[PDB]
Amino acid sequence: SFRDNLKVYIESPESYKNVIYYDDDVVLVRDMFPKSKMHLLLMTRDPHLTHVHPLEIMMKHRSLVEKLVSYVQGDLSGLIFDEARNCLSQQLTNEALCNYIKVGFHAGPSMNNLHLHIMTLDHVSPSLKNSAHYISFTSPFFVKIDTPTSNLPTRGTLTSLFQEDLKCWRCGETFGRHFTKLKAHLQEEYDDWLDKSVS
Amino acid sequence: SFRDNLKVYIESPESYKNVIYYDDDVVLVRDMFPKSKMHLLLMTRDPHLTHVHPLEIMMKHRSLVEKLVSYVQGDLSGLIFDEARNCLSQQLTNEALCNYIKVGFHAGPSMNNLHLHIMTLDHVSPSLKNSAHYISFTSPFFVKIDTPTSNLPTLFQEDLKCWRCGETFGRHFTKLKAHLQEEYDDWLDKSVS
Ligand SMILES: Nc1nc2c(ncn2[C@@H]2O[C@H](COP(=O)(O)O)[C@@H](O)[C@H]2O)c(=O)[nH]1
Ligand SMILES: Nc1nc2c(ncn2[C@@H]2O[C@H](CO)[C@@H](O)[C@H]2O)c(=O)[nH]1
Ligand SMILES: [Zn+2]
Ligand SMILES: [Zn+2]
């Protein structure tokens, strides 16, 4: 099934050119359908954890949460910032980018193998093709990795994401059901952020 | 009244040892009663903006909002990280600190001259002495500077909640205090180089 598509990256990371880091424990892979300018997935290779729902990981497997966060903040940090510079602009410092990257799980992932999203905020991407994808990263369905355990949402359903009034994550302007207009506005917001942020 | 006391920093910043930056437009000053390990205030010197309510600034003075943000992320960012290192640990990188600093206005300001808080998340401080102090920085009363304008208002009653893990302590302020210290030690241990 398509839900098992990510398994190949944790079975044979050495074989896939969009895997930009691996070791015995984790794989860092570029999303092939990126939903922001930079969109990476950090995957555990542990066969006993990969099929655990991310909300069960956040509640009951804090050892893994801490290990994943230690990779994002530690050994992989320079790699992630360099990928953002490649995806956005080389003139962005780590300091500019830190505030423009989010890290989290979906409350209802479409793929079966556990994957932590590491992505820029912009949501400017040709692969962002419908508003359910947008909502899945800009609502509580996106469970940030530092969410207090008391605050975790319910297990979700990607296909039930729907908003009658689509909303810009940065300024709050709304667009009804007109996703095309929202995308054009996200491009303007990105242009503005970039102008204000480059060195 | 004493509520006008921050005015001295924007009138005569050269005169006060807790001012760590000034220019014609802004002053960056240490909070005298810090509510986290690092707690700074960034103040406009503009006499026509200093007395404007912070929610009116957020709604109607986006020019000033963008200017404050540009100072905080731009020209003052190294001073801010250096201050954080002086207050927390010299072993902390800018990258570790950037996720541990919040920037915002109180929705109901306690002083009359406009002041943007720039502070670490810990709330470990001898000057944090009651529940109102804590809740005013960890609840929607603290209006982050990146809040969308669609989300702005025109509470302190509820149970104390750790901002980091969400554990609650009822109205037991002293238990919250000890817990914040444990949370800070834990963050620090994982964050130092
Ligand atoms: N540097 C300085 N800070 C002050 C003085 N008086 C009060 N403060 C700080 O000013 C802040 C005002 O925050 P507010 O609640 O008004 O948004 C408080 O955190 C308080 O500790 C003072 O004379 N000098
Ligand atoms: N790299 C990669 N990403 C995928 C594949 N199938 C789905 N995705 C992405 O994986 C994520 C799962 O939520 C989404 O962001 C998808 O765009 C695939 O075969 N390879
Ligand atoms: Zn917008
Ligand atoms: Zn806690």
Residue numbers in the entry:
A (entry chain A): 33 to 231
B (entry chain B): 33 to 186, 193 to 231
Lines quoted from the article behind this entry:
Aprataxin catalyzes the conversion of A5′pp5′DNA to AMP and pDNA via a covalent enzyme-(histidinyl)–AMP intermediate.
The crystals contained two aprataxin protomers in the asymmetric unit. The refined model included guanosine in the active site of the A protomer and GMP in the active site of the B protomer, in identical positions and anti nucleoside conformations. The planar purine ring of the guanine nucleobase is sandwiched by van der Waals contacts to Leu38 and Met64. The Tyr41 hydroxyl engages in direct bifurcated hydrogen bonds to the guanine N1 and N2 atoms and in a water-bridged contact to the guanine O6. Asp63 is a bidentate acceptor of hydrogen bonds from the 2′-OH and 3′-OH groups. Lys67 makes a direct hydrogen bond to the 2′-OH and a water-mediated contact to the 3′-OH.
